[PDB]
Amino acid sequence: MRHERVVIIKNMFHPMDFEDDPLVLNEIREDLRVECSKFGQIRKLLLFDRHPDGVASVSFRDPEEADYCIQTLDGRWFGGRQITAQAWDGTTDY
């Protein structure tokens, strides 16, 4: 084999963030899409908005694009949280 194109990003939010502002979810989604567009063609972008670990997945067209994304985002700060970015393990669901 698998040449991984999917990036799993964590700690981007906590689901309570969307409890009292119905606009934050779409703002975070767009923030991520705009940034990730610089790394490669996005095939699919998902926010797991009820996952307690603040998870998003970004699928790219090429594995090099996923690599560039992981290199740039892992350990970066987002909205006051330090995020992780890693290649999908191919098994875990969110």
């Binding site: 923030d31 705009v34 940034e35 700060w77 987002f78 006051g80």
Partner: peptide, 7 residues
Amino acid sequence: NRWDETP
């Protein structure tokens, strides 16, 4: 955007 915002 929220990129690079610290606590």
